[PDB]
């Protein structure tokens, strides 16, 4: 009847074996059985964060029903998961959903405790388009219904605890977020399932690496689900990287190129070269087909092993005598040993086609899923670390301390030596004014992501008041910009791997440092909506120029250490001391000498040449002009920006003056020669 | 017909006599009738805190319409009341509140200038979703509606000063708070209704006592409502006590238990004992039935008395001539005198019991939900229940309290104005605690202010109250919240000499006005509280010269010292500076004994029977004693030197609850024994 027209038997798919081997969580199944045989508050309801196999725990109940692990009073029962959507559709006329639903009610009354109902997302039973809550709630508040609920904690606060008229029908059957090692056992059983569909093999160190690196890095998804999806996705990655070669593409583009060349030339030699490479192509192609046939035979006989296991479970339920012993002691050891023979034969023959999932597969999948360099070190990264030290000396000459500090920090990040209790680089910069601080931060941004401004430049010169935390973090609910979120929650919770930059942090009003405490202790941050934000894959650089007078007074005739401790005491006067010791290391800059500014002049002149190429001009400077610029754009008191002003003035004022005259023709190398005082551009 | 859906014909209810014969308030009713017969702006509002019966004022107006006391614009009208919450609560979508609202206006125009409207919660109608005031704007303006408001003054100044159409499409009618005597006459009018309902009688001196205690021990609720609740709940309690009984339950359980025993035994004696207890139970039962029949007759004749009163009011409306004199001169005095015969009869026969509710029932209802003056007669004994010595200060404080509750001096001047001197630790603060305790309520239900701290202008801005638009604002001064949340407490001022002398100006405004203006624009009165100022200026002057030197001259000497210190204006306003001399070594030893008493109380809370040597008590009293500080070093030293070695031995597994534990001396210390 309508049970067969609108419900879904979970125990039939348990009988058909389609469902998942639910491993672990025995205790909650036991507590569920306990609540099920309770007179008052009869219907249990499952409570957890989503993604934790609540539906699977109900199917594991069904597993123990069909296998008979349940108590005798629950043997021979029925588990029919009612479809709401089946009920909704055909009710075109008036009260047909009423009619259908009351017929389901009557049939459930007729079944008399034999069928046990399970409808999750219980709010849909509260209303299904009067409709369902007012119709079922009688059988709820009469005890004839013996259903099981399952929900997210959100509906347990919203749509359950509000109606206290539903309180004495239920029970906080709380499912906990599972741990690492139960996820490892679950993944062992589901490896045994999943290798059917992806036709591959999975190493167990790769499984414990999946559990470990899933639990460590992501936060939006939880055990067990994130590690399981890493398994499924990386198995698909293996499936694809087996599913087409690459050396075949190399040689195929080569032979079609030599084919086009030989057909164009119609000396030859290319018939011979093309024939040899076509022979190579056909050999590797046929080897590819033979090894794919090895995959085929191996995985089909593996699937036959699995079907033997399923059928011998069928015989365990039914109870045949010679069929049990026949299937076991015949079918299992021979298929196992020839599956191992095919496995060692693949260990012989699989050349370009590593079908066993390493942990590096998992790490690459995770890296391209989160953003962190989780993938193992291709040696472009090692030369990139050589380039880290060197290329920091490219866009920043001078100030070798913080160069070393940031270099060491990303080094301790990449080799896994970082601390997963804190974000990676908890830096605070200091020093005199205009001396490449924001430059170093853009230099990292240019390094790490090949983009000068791709970095969260939250500027602590707006936050001079109390309500500015409500600017950057977010808004508490009910109020104005609550649904838009803040800025830091957006720009971190999307992509957890960036250079969080806090420009001029001393100007912010000193309640915002509470947020900095939660950052530079934990790296999870209570935003205004309710949730958290992982910071432990970021770098938090903060800039300021607190001890300006002190450092420009005393960088000469002093060490680095007592200068550091002296400006450290100044910071102790300015921040909370609870803040300042939650820092990796305060670095101390200092102003520049003449060679530094001369090199900076070389830098700005090279980007100026980069500019004037686009207009169409090229300049080779007099070396005497370097001396005039270094005399002009220099002072220890104010750092670097008088050089930008001096070069800007003394070059580009007569230069632009004479460009707009139409006088300086594209085609001539503009030798910027000098007068005794000024710069005179010539045309030769 | 939304009138059937949303309104209440109060004229029908009072026409059927359902409503209160509301008493008084005639000036305000008349001003409402003035407003209700204007050409435009035909809407009064009623401004008063809820529970003053503005509803009942409209009800009494409706009863006057039933009487027809109205001028010639109101004869034949129908007064109908309405909520806004009945309209707001059905707003699923756009335009569902407002269909109801316009259909209301269609019924209002449909009755064609015949219906007077009532709406309370006017400040509710401000906010519903524009929403509500603008649809009522034309009918409020064009005379086609006769709305009557009811709200509170705070909600008036919060809501109704916003929309000007919400202002001038209404009119203020001020609603006042009812007095003591008018409440008495009201309850006299309400006495017969209550006595009809709860089937019992009421003591009218208990009514005026209920009024007195309702003003006395209740702060929130007010009149008529709080006395209504008191008399109703007391009458219900008495009606439950009558409509039960307890000795009948005891006798019934006794006879059924002895019946089961005699059924088991079948020597006897139990047939005889059972027959005696059944006879006694039957006597109590027949007495119970006779009492219930007597109260039944009393309630029936009381209800017939009320029906005769309703009939003579109907004769006053209709105008029957001989019916007036007949009903009055016959029916009223004979039914009242045999109702009083029933009163004295039930005073005779209710035994197990009363029906006339006394003021002790009011005390039950009140303290659940009277020796004050005579305790104040023995108030010095009360203060020396706990604090030994300093008899003169106790006497003077009791003099001040007797002058206070006797009310001789200026009532606009505060109760206690006392500067205290001498060395501390003897129990000045203990005197403050016990003073607030046996004076009003409790030891630490007070306010303590550390005036050692406050030495500058910003310090004054702290304790007084920051001016608005500055640092320390939205919860007043240090003082102001502390008193405004504590309407009856004691203010404590420690180390008055450390203050900058400008705070003394605030003290002088206290002593003159008693109302004190903070930075928050509201005066928090001190007239129902006690200010205590304390210091220690002439401590050594007393310590050196307490020996055989009197109270008065030494008081005058240290008063001259204070005159060297403080303002002459300040010492002008002092009631009295007591001495607070150091008492003695034996009295401070006795205070240590009382600390041992509360200590042994806490040991008995753990459950130990512990005794002590008196020499051990002397060593205790000589451990931490100092004249320079008082008993507080003695208190903490005895507390440490007991709690450390004793509980050390207890956690050493030595002391057993239920043994002879004599705190015997060591050579310098105290050991406990186990015997």
């Amino acid at each position: 009847q309508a049970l067969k027209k609108y419900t879904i038997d979970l125990t039939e798919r348990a009988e058909q074996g389609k469902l998942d081997p639910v491993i672990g969580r025995d205790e909650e199944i036991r507590r569920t059985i306990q609540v099920l045989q309770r007179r008052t508050k009869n219907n249990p309801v499952l409570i957890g964060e989503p993604g934790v196999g609540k539906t699977a725990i109900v199917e594991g109940l069904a597993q123990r029903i069909i296998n008979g692990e349940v108590p005798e009073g629950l043997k021979g029962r029925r588990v029919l998961a009612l479809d709401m959507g089946a009920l909704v559709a055909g009710a075109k006329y008036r009260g047909e959903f009423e009619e259908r639903l009351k017929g389901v009610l009557n049939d459930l009354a007729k079944q008399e405790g034999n069928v046990i109902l399970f409808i999750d997302a219980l709010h849909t039973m509260v209303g299904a388009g009067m409709d369902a809550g007012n119709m079922l709630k009688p059988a709820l508040a009469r005890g004839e219904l013996h259903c099981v609920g399952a929900t997210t904690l959100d509906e347990y606060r919203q749509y359950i605890e509000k109606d206290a008229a539903l309180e004495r029908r239920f029970q906080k059957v709380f499912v906990a977020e599972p741990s690492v090692e139960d996820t490892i056992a679950i993944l062992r059983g589901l490896k045994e399932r999943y290798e059917l569909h992806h036709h591959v093999q999975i190493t167990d160190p790769a499984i414990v690496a999946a559990a470990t690196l899933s639990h460590r890095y992501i936060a939006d998804r939880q055990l067990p689900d994130k590690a399981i999806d890493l398994i499924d996705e990386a198995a698909s990655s293996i499936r694809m990287q087996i599913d087409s070669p690459e050396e075949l593409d190399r040689l195929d583009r080569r032979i079609i190129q030599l084919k086009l060349e030989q057909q164009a030339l119609m000396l030859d030699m290319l018939n011979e070269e093309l024939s040899d490479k076509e022979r190579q192509y056909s050999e590797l192609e046929e080897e590819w087909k033979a090894e794919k046939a090895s995959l085929s035979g191996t995985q089909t006989i593996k699937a036959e092993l699995e079907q033997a296991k399923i059928a011998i479970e069928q015989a365990r339920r039914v109870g045949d005598l010679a069929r049990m012993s026949e299937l076991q002691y015949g079918k299992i050891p021979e298929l196992e040993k020839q599956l191992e023979a095919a496995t060692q034969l693949e260990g012989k023959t699989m050349r370009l086609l590593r079908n066993k999932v390493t942990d590096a597969e998992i790490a690459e999948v995770l890296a391209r899923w989160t953003g962190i360099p989780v993938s193992r070190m291709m040696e472009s990264e090692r030369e990139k670390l050589l380039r880290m030290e060197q290329e920091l000396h490219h866009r920043v000459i001078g100030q070798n301390e913080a160069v070393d500090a940031v270099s060491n920090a990303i080094r301790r990040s990449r080799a896994g030596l970082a601390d997963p209790n804190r974000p990676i680089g908890s830096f605070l910069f200091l020093g005199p004014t205009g001396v490449g601080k924001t430059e170093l931060c853009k230099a990292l941004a240019n390094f790490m992501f090949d983009s000068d401004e791709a970095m969260v430049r939250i500027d602590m010169s707006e936050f001079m008041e109390k309500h500015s935390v409500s600017r950057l973090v977010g808004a508490p609910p009910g109020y104005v910009g609550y649904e838009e979120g803040g800025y830091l929650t957006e720009a971190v919770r999307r992509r957890p791997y960036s250079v969080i930059l806090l420009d001029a942090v001393e100007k912010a009003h000193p309640d915002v440092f509470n947020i900095l405490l939660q950052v530079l202790d934990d790296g999870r941050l209570t935003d205004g909506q309710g949730r958290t934000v992982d910071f432990r894959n970021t770098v938090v650089i903060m800039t300021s120029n607190l001890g300006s007078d002190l450092i420009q007074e005393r960088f000469g005739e002093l060490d680095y250490a007592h200068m550091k401790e002296l400006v450290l005491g100044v910071v102790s006067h300015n921040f909370r001391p609870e803040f300042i010791n939650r820092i990796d290391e305060v670095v101390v800059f200092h102003p520049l000498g003449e060679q530094h500014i001369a090199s900076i002049a070389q830098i700005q002149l090279k980007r100026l040449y980069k500019r004037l190429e686009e207009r169409g001009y090229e300049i080779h400077i007099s070396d005497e002009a370097l001396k005039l610029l270094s005399e002009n754009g220099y002072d220890p008191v104010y750092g670097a920006r008088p050089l930008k002003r001096a070069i800007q003035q003394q070059i580009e004022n007569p230069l632009a003056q004479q460009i707009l005259s139409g006088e300086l023709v594209p085609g001539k190398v503009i030798r910027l020669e000098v007068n005794e005082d000024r710069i005179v551009a010539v045309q030769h | 017909q939304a009138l059937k859906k949303y309104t209440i014909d109060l004229t029908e209810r009072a026409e059927q006599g359902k409503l209160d014969p509301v008493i008084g308030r005639d000036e305000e009713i008349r001003r409402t009738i003035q407003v209700l017969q204007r050409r435009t702006k035909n809407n009064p509002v009623l401004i008063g805190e809820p529970g003053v019966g503005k509803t009942a004022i409209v009800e009494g107006l409706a009863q006057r319409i039933i009487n027809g006391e109205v001028p010639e614009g109101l004869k034949g009208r129908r007064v109908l009341a309405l909520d806004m919450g009945a309209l707001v609560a059905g707003a699923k979508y756009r335009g569902e509140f407002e269909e109801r609202l316009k259909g209301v206006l269609n019924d209002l125009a449909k009755q064609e200038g015949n219906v007077i409207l009532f709406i309370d919660a006017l400040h509710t109608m401000v906010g519903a979703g524009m929403d509500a005031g603008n649809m009522l704007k034309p009918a409020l303006a064009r005379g086609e509606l006769h709305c009557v408001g009811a709200t509170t003054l705070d909600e008036y100044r919060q809501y109704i000063e916003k929309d000007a159409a919400l202002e001038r499409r209404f009119q203020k009618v001020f609603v006042a708070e009812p007095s003591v005597e008018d409440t008495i006459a009201i309850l006299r009018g309400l006495k017969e209704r209550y006595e009809l309902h709860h089937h019992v009688q009421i003591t009218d001196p208990a009514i005026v006592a209920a009024a007195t205690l309702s003003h006395r021990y209740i702060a929130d609720r007010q009149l008529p409502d709080k006395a209504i609740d008191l008399i109703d709940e007391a009458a219900s309690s008495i009606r439950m006590q009558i409509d039960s009984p307890e000795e009948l339950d005891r006798l019934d359980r006794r006879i059924i238990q002895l019946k089961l025993e005699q059924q088991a035994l079948m020597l006897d004696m139990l047939n005889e004992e059972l027959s005696d207890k059944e006879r006694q139970y039957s006597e109590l039962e027949e007495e119970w039935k006779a009492e219930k029949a007597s109260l039944s007759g009393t309630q029936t004749i009381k209800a017939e008395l009320e029906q005769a009163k309703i009939a003579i009011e109907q004769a006053r409306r209709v105008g029957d001539l001989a019916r007036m004199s007949e009903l009055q001169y016959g029916k009223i005095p004979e039914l009242e005198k045999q109702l009083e015969a029933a009163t004295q009869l039930e005073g005779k026969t209710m035994r197990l019991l009363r029906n006339k509710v006394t003021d002790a029932e009011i005390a039950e209802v009140l303290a659940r939900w009277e020796s004050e003056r005579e305790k104040l007669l023995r108030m010095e004994q009360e203060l020396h229940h706990r604090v030994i010595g300093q008899n003169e200060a106790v006497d003077a404080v009791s003099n001040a309290i007797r002058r206070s509750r006797a009310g001789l001096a200026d009532p606009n001047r505060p109760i206690g104005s006392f500067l205290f001197l001498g060395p501390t630790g003897v129990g000045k603060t203990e005197l403050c605690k016990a003073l607030a305790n046996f004076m009003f309520d409790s030891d630490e239900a007070m306010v303590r202010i550390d005036m050692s701290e406050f030495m500058e202008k910003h310090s004054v801005s702290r304790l007084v109250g920051a001016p608005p638009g500055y640092v320390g604002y939205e919860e007043g001064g240090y003082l102001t919240e502390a008193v405004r949340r504590r309407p009856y407490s004691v203010i404590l001022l420690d180390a008055v000499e450390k203050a900058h002398p400008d705070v003394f100006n605030i003290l002088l405004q206290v002593l003159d006005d008693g109302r004190l203006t903070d930075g928050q624009g509201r005066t928090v009165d001190f007239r129902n509280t006690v200010v205590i100022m304390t210091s220690n200026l002439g401590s050594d002057l007393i310590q050196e010269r307490f020996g055989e030197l009197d109270y008065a001259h030494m008081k005058e000497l240290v008063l001259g010292v204070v005159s060297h210190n403080f303002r002459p204006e300040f010492i002008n306003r002092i009631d009295e500076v007591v001495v607070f001399h150091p008492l003695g070594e034996q009295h401070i030893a006795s205070i240590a004994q009382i600390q041992l008493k509360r200590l042994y109380k806490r040991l008995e809370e753990r459950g130990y029977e512990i005794h002590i040597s008196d020499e051990a008590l002397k060593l205790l009293s000589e451990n931490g004693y100092d004249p320079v500080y008082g008993a507080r070093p003695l208190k903490r030293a005895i507390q440490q030197q007991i709690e450390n070695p004793l509980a050390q031995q207890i956690l050493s597994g030595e002391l057993v609850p239920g043994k002879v534990i004599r705190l015997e001396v060591n050579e310098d210390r105290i050991v406990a024994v186990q015997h």
């Binding site: 104005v480 | 756009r94 638009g469």
Partner: peptide, 24 residues
């Protein structure tokens, strides 16, 4: 038979305020 008619569904949001001290 009839149709599930569309609705109107009036909704609302709110505001905080902010008060600001002076130092002196």
């Amino acid at each position: 038979a009839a149709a599930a008619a569309a609705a109107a569904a009036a909704a609302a949001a709110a505001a905080a305020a902010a008060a600001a001290a002076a130092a002196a």
